[PDB]
Amino acid sequence: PVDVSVSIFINKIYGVNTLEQTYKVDGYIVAQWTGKPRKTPGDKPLIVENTQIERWINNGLWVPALEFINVVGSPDTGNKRLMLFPDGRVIYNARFLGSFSNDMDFRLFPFDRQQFVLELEPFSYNNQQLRFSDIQVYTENIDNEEIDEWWIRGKASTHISDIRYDHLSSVQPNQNEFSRITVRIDAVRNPSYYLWSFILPLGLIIAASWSVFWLESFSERLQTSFTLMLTVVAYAFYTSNILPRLPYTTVIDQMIIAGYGSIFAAILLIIFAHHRQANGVEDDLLIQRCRLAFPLGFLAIGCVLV
Amino acid sequence: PVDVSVSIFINKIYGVNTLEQTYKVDGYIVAQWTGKPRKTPGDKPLIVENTQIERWINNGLWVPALEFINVVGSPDTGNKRLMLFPDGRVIYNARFLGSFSNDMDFRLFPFDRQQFVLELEPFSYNNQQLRFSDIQVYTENIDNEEIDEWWIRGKASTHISDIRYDHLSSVQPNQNEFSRITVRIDAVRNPSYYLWSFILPLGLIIAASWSVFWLESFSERLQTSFTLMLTVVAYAFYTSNILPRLPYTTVIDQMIIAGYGSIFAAILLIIFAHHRQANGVEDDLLIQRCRLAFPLGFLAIGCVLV
Amino acid sequence: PVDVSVSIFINKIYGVNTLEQTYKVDGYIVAQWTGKPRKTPGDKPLIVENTQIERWINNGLWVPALEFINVVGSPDTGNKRLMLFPDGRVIYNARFLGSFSNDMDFRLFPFDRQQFVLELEPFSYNNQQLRFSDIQVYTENIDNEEIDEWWIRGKASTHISDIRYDHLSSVQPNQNEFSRITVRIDAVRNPSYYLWSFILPLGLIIAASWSVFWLESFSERLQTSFTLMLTVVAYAFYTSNILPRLPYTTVIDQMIIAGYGSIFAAILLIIFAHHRQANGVEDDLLIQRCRLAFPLGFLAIGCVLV
Amino acid sequence: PVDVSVSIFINKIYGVNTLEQTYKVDGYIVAQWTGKPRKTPGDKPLIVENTQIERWINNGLWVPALEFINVVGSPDTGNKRLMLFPDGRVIYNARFLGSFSNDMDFRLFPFDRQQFVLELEPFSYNNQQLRFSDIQVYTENIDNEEIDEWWIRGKASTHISDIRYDHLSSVQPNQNEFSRITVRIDAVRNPSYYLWSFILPLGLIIAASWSVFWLESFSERLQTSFTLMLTVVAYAFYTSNILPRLPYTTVIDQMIIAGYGSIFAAILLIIFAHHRQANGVEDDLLIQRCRLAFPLGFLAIGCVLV
Amino acid sequence: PVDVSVSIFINKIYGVNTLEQTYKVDGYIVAQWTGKPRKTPGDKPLIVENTQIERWINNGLWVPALEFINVVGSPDTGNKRLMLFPDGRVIYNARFLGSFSNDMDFRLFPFDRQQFVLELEPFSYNNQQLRFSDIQVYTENIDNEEIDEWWIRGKASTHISDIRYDHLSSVQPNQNEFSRITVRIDAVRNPSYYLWSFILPLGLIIAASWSVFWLESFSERLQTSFTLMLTVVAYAFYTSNILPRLPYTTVIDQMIIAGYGSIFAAILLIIFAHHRQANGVEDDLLIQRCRLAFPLGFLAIGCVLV
């Protein structure tokens, strides 16, 4: 039943890799908790540098290493400190830089209120409870609004929850339940580059594609149909090479499927001209009647699939 | 004849690189096995942190480091624990994140029930037997069905086998045989992006390729033949740059070979028009007869090579 | 109230990654500060190599590890030295190579007087003051003026400021205020490659785009309109693949938006020819009148958006 | 004159990077050699884990660290073992995973019987001789014949040689000569992907290039000459981006030089039509005579340059 | 005034990254210098392995760690040795593999006699002089002349210089001057791949560009002008993606600027045909007179800008 009061500084959130669904965060954890009141030599409380901590594990000072569940690997314990007060209160801060991983659903790929969920747990302590959470983001992030991608943010929002394992330990009564700190932080991507040159060639190259139907010769309309087939695969060739790649297609490239299938259906009208089953290749009066539903029958698909 | 009961937690499977044929997995191994009953100071059993383990190797506590055969290198022993009971039972868990490597046959490249075969062995112990296997996957993976690529899974399926080396040791009788834990786990890739924009331009650009035969001029049909030659190499140019690369061609690009060879054979009909050995370039009535086998003679190849 | 006099050597600034907004710097920090006058054996002052420092932390020599706030992770303490004078003055130099990160606004992307802001702080010392700053850049960097990108520089410019935390410590009176060294260094990119082949095809492919309006046939003007649509996306395909990528569009690619929208508006004039609501496709005398505002109405946009 | 008997296990050969000319190999080295007969406590011989070896260097057990000359850096000593027999025989195995580098000539780039030459040396021992070599490859590699690139192999083939340095030491008589183990292992690449879609578009795009000469108009033949110039640089654009890159051109791209130079020479015939120094652009009867040497004069170059 | 005789082995020079201006080198440093004559137990001189050196720093053996100024970071001290003679002579060799960085001017980008300048310094020793330099390159590098890029070399050329710092120390008289070993080694790149397919499409695509002027129709000449604009940006798209990238344009791509500007000036002649201010689009007799200066006025630019 040992109390722990935590505090989180957040310096930097960066580097989102979505094939792993990972990101990287930087800041300081701070643990303040009362242990046993010892004497501090001199008057000022004792301080201890990086390697010197490994002198004070030898006499068994109860310093709990606090894991991460979202992490992959082990974060670099860069610098450390023990503000050992003579009243038993211990302050322990640490710079951390780990590769964190949590679920990031892409419901709408440019505009996404996403939620980086940092956490903390005690790795080998059942009911040595984490009493007081504190999120202490203090860096001025919103001010470079056009600059920072994700950091056009809302509000810091901590939480303390509880979780219980049963298969893990042998003692099932009331000492197999871990106190879990779950510090979620929301973030919105700056969608400027993700909207300016992303779907702007997409949504109107189909609005360039309806000029093949206003042609009368199958020497000028076939090479433009081949040009329509070339430019869409050149476009799909432009897509993934910039972006962090995905095992499920983005909302942008839900319409390269249509940039196929519409021209795929336009081949049916071109061959309805070619295999016009009374005369030649010349467009019939039914082909002069689909002249309006060919531009306007495919730009009305963008408003239903969002 | 020392018993060992193991348990595996599985947190994350990710990052498949197939030029190495490797992947990365995260979780906790847990060893529970009875050694010698000592005294635990106080009433609660003894616990030991990360660096403090290296105090307890000095008095020779029998802590077996458990290797991996599928690994390349050495996995990061991030955090550790010794739940030393006074009855002699030892619990030792560890977070692991190693680059594992095992054979992954690509029989069908989008749809593949693949099998990640984690294992464990004792590195330097002959007949100190691993008695009780336990796979304990507990993370909710299926729920984000569209999101997780591989994790649309089946069932956890452990196994304990036996393997024997003979060239390795000098003692051949009954102490050169290792107990091998072989925890296989199946996984199915989410084939959405791998099917939506992968072969959809492939299987019908040939269905765009048969419009060159419905032409009468060798000024409009030659530039479209060159367009057919350009677009297939632009397509092959689109392929590998997204995908993890392969020393053996995927089932998708078994048909860029045909996207050559069909147009390669179409040059024979174009030159049968050009070198029509009685008159000029004009299509003969045999060329007006292959007008049906030219679309429909190559879309029937997709159903035999699977 | 312990005085510290610092000195910074700067050997190399390189490797700007702007998705992190990071760079890498190399040089030597030097701390000169008087502690306590001890005896030096022999006559010459004591020197101490790399690992030997960890003999002299055991007797508690007050060696302050000096952090970095711009860093991400921990820089490699390659080599070290303690010029321990018998009068108490300590000289401590160290080679450093860390990934530093600070805000780099891209107001104008080729021409940018940017400001790499190295810093230093005491990690766990409140009022042990850093008295004397000194920047000592000494490498000849300007001499290879065409060669070095950023190093066409101005002047070294140190500073000593002060910063105070209040939430951090428990003692609020006058011992929660850190002395902060903030050594800013300016740098100008060598814009040769960034100007020679960057916007030179950009600003006049629109000056190639006005030849579609001097055409009379909709068999030659439609395929050139499709060529204009192809070349702009091939250009945008050329852009990002060389450059370090950005979440906000560069000043170069503010005009691929116009390379869309101008040709997008040119489709309105082409369809004003096509849907000329008295006769056919032939250009009216209003279309023969926009022959001058079509070249010269879009090259005058480059002078307002800078 | 201390005898050493070595043994090599080979688990995996992978990851060939040819700009370094490096690869990566995995397996176990095993040293068996008799030192001094000590006592083993109990009856079973002594075993020693990873960190525990550093207790047994303190009493000066003669454990020779065995270097590698092909390596770049230092391989990861993952796990270790000392099977210390009471008769003085020492068995020491180690998992190794190093970046090895040796000369790999590319005489023929798809089909290459290459030779990975692992080695071993004593780093600081002159005439403490390595008596008995043993290569012990035991993994079933050939069975996945289509799958494994290099591992379609021949036979393991060890060797023990001798090498002498003279500039190295000061004692020149008979104690400056190192025993060198040179375990070469051959390997053949699986050339399936390297032949299926590598030169198949190469060797017959020239067989598409001879249709420009069967044209009569310089409005249809010039744009196809420009198409021939476009497609060859689009092809060269396809090449290097998949492949591991080279400072000397592969045998595949010895013919993009000809894919230039042949069309380069075809410009001479096109301008012989254009600058026909009696009349116009119309093809003379000499241009109607080179109609056969233009296809068949360049497909006969593939059989001489191999 | 302590003498040091050095010796350098050079095994491998590889991996030139020019955005850092770095490379990687492998070999052995050897220090031979007389200290104090001690006793060697037995008759043979004492040898000391890797970790065992850290027993002999404890009794304060004067082993100088020798830095590098061209390095970025810290090179991996892989293996080590102390040939401690009883006469006081110490031999210390070490394998090194560091990322070295020195200025590499690109005066001519394919053909460049470049100069890798390795160095050495004493990190914390003023006048403990490095007396005898020795470069001892011994690997057979020239023999694979087509294979090795840089290693078509000249001659090893050592040097010993002197350098003095004044701001560094407090003692200015004669003990603030470091002995600097500066072992420069020249190297010439194998220019085969850098010349075969690098500028060969460059220098004559302009020699393909003068066929637009021999056209009479503005329906065939405008689409070829657009083809000339497309192919040059497709070429520039081919360039950087293979090559190590540069903040200053290579000598190859000094002429894509001209591949713009010449066709840019050709638009002036095309519009001189179009805006021929007496009649129509038809080429005047002045346009029939620039038919010779249009091919031959731009191939004479390659011989002045080198």
Side-chain angles (χ1 to χ4, degrees), chain C residues 32-78:
Chain C
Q32 298 159 340
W33 53 271
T34 311
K36 290 182 172 305
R38 303 166 38 193
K39 57 102 179 179
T40 48
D43 196 20
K44 284 315 281 170
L46 182 49
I47 214 71
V48 168
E49 297 89 70
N50 266 340
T51 308
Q52 200 62 219
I53 288 176
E54 282 75 8
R55 293 304 178 199
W56 296 100
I57 317 180
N58 306 329
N59 62 337
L61 294 189
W62 191 71
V63 183
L66 313 176
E67 66 175 340
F68 297 96
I69 298 302
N70 288 308
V71 73
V72 285
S74 162
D76 43 357
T77 321

Side-chain angles (χ1 to χ4, degrees), chain A residues 12 28 89 144 208 211 220, chain C residues 20 67 103 170 219 226 236 240:
Chain A
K12 193 160 194 293
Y28 292 91
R89 182 183 184 190
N144 262 338
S211 51
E220 59 151 348
Chain C
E20 221 285 325
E67 66 175 340
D103 271 336
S170 281
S219 284
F226 280 128
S240 66

